[PDB]
Design a protein around this nucleic acid. Structure first.
Lengths: 53, 126, 136
RNA sequence: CGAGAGGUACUUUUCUUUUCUUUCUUCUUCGG
């Protein structure tokens, strides 16, 4: 729920998180700050590709 | 070519955090030389915990075949700076373009370093 | 090994004792923290950079020291460093059997030449804490 | 050409380390 757009989802057959529609993030650091506030700094690492647009 | 080689192990971090987004002044006491060290290491790029060991070389050159301004690529934290103060239980004061170093140890281990010279800093975490 | 009170080196100054208590009870076991005290320079609105925590047993204290030496206690981007304190927060013996609860205490002196005992008063439901380290 | 009105026009213009004290209940000293 900490993401603004629909970037991360929930897998009902595994009870874990997945990534659906990855080109909808808009680079607002809302889940990285939430993971750092939850004590997991190396949980989600999102980097932009310099050769893909 | 290398005038200083030792095996350091850290003991303290100055911010002592994970995501401070700043530089961390480490405190590393060395084995079999009793030498203290201050160094500003970028933790967010080159991670360093408290308890791990790392080697440290300090050579004025890199190509290891003379030519004072093929290279040494056995390390992972190669830096470069100048030594501006040898004011001494001797202690060095090296600035790597803004990141300060303080290599304080015995006066016999550090004696070949001159004043206002250009020297590198080689590091590898074993 | 004498006391169980542990002093944390660098706690954040924007927290309350409940946030540290829930963090310590989330990393360690449930309700394993007996006492927790953050000293304040002012009366109730300026905590300091360190705090004292007292655990219930020595095994959880050694486990917290092992977690702090391996750098596994990250509380709001702050690596907690444990050390040794000066004294206990509460003078209580760390032993589940030494804390005698709801016992009968009576006073007096031997009256006759035999090993008898005359009681002046009687106290029911008292505590008994045998402090071996403080020798009292 | 003088009077009456409204308007632009001084904006923070000097707060200082942000690290300052609570781990407390502890031998008076000399000579008869």
């Amino acid at each position: 729920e900490s993401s603004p757009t629909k970037v991360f989802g929930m897998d009902p057959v595994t009870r874990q998180v997945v990534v659906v529609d990855p080109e909808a993030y808009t680079y607002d650091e809302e889940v990285i700050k939430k993971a750092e506030a939850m004590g997991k700094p190396g949980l989600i690492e999102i980097s932009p590709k310099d050769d893909s647009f | 070519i290398i005038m200083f080689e030792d095996i350091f192990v850290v003991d303290k971090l100055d911010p002592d955090g994970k995501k401070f987004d700043k530089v961390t002044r480490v405190e590393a006491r060395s084995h079999n030389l009793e030498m203290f060290m201050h160094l500003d290491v970028n933790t967010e790029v080159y991670p360093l915990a408290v308890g791990d060991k790392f080697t440290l070389a300090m050579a004025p050159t890199l190509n290891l075949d003379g030519t004072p301004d093929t290279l040494a690529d056995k390390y992972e934290y190669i830096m470069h700076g100048k030594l501006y103060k040898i004011s001494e239980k001797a202690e060095l004061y090296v600035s790597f373009g803004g990141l300060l170093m303080l290599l304080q140890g015995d006066p016999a281990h550090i004696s070949h370093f001159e004043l206002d010279q250009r020297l590198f800093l080689l590091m590898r975490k074993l | 090994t004498n006391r169980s009170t542990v002093k944390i080196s660098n706690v954040p100054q924007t927290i309350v004792a409940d946030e540290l208590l829930r963090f310590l009870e989330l990393h360690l076991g449930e309700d394993t923290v007996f006492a927790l005290e953050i000293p304040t320079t002012r009366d109730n609105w300026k905590p300091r950079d360190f705090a004292r925590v007292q655990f219930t047993t020595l095994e959880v204290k050694s486990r917290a020291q092992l977690l702090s030496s391996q750098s596994k206690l990250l509380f709001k981007t702050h690596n907690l460093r444990l050390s040794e304190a000066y004294d206990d927060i509460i003078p209580r013996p760390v032993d589940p059997r030494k804390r005698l609860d709801d016992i009968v205490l009576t006073v007096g002196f031997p009256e006759s030449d035999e090993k008898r005992f005359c009681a002046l008063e009687k106290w029911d439901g008292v505590r008994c804490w045998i402090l071996t380290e403080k020798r009292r």
